């Protein structure tokens, strides 16, 4: 909502710096696995100046500072670095406790940064502004977004909500709630078209979405959002004597991809990433051909819904 100039930009890279300043602290103890806050943020930093040059050598700084994502972009920044600050500064010695809901904070904030990282990649690609220009993976997906949004790059919560209710009934404000929790990746209470993308692909297919993401990311015992791939194999252990337990996985560095994990029939744990089937397809056909049998290690898959 503040205009994108570089006066504005720097006083989010302050607050990002201060950021980093926090939480390269080594009594932190922050463990080495994705997201690396630490990369993210000066990453993050870098394509911002490679957007500056690009819009300074052609001397459109005017159009930049005007664009609606990009003003959305850094005030997001802004407000999340702000968010982190505040979260050291109250969090007080609770930052060093690992299993500490300040430091649970933490990693959301730096899940929520990566992703911002990978959106502001996707629609400045080579520094260039390309919102407009970002094609859609899932075919009937790209069919809605560009029907009730057009080009448009970004969109608000409320509005992306009441038009996605026209083709697929949101229940309730509740499901609202849950759903905006899953898409709003950012958690920026807007829609961008690379969220969109994500959420279609995971979730494919489109015409029965809402279905689809009910029953695997919110009734599905075997779902478990972001995770490591050690952390997959870790929480899998458990279940070695028993063939046919599954979980499921987001990847932060490859978004719009799932994981999944499964114990073998000679107790081994193996991960697999379907490229060319969609998840629901993936699970179902495995269900019923063997392989993916205990959500979690739990006695029955969930029923359909
Ligand atoms: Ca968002
Ligand atoms: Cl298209
Ligand atoms: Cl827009
Ligand atoms: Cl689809």
New binding site residues.
Partial sequence: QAAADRRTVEKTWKLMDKVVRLCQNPKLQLKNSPPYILDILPDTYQHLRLILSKYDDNQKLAQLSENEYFKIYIDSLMKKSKRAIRLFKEGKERMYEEQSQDRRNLTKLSLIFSHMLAEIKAIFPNGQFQGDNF??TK?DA?EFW?KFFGDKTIVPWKVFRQCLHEVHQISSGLEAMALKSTIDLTCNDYISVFEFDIFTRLFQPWGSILRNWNFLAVTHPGYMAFLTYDEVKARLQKYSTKPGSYIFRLSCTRLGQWAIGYVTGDGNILQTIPHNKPLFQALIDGSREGFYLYPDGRSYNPDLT
């Fill in positions: 094609r859609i075919a790209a560009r």
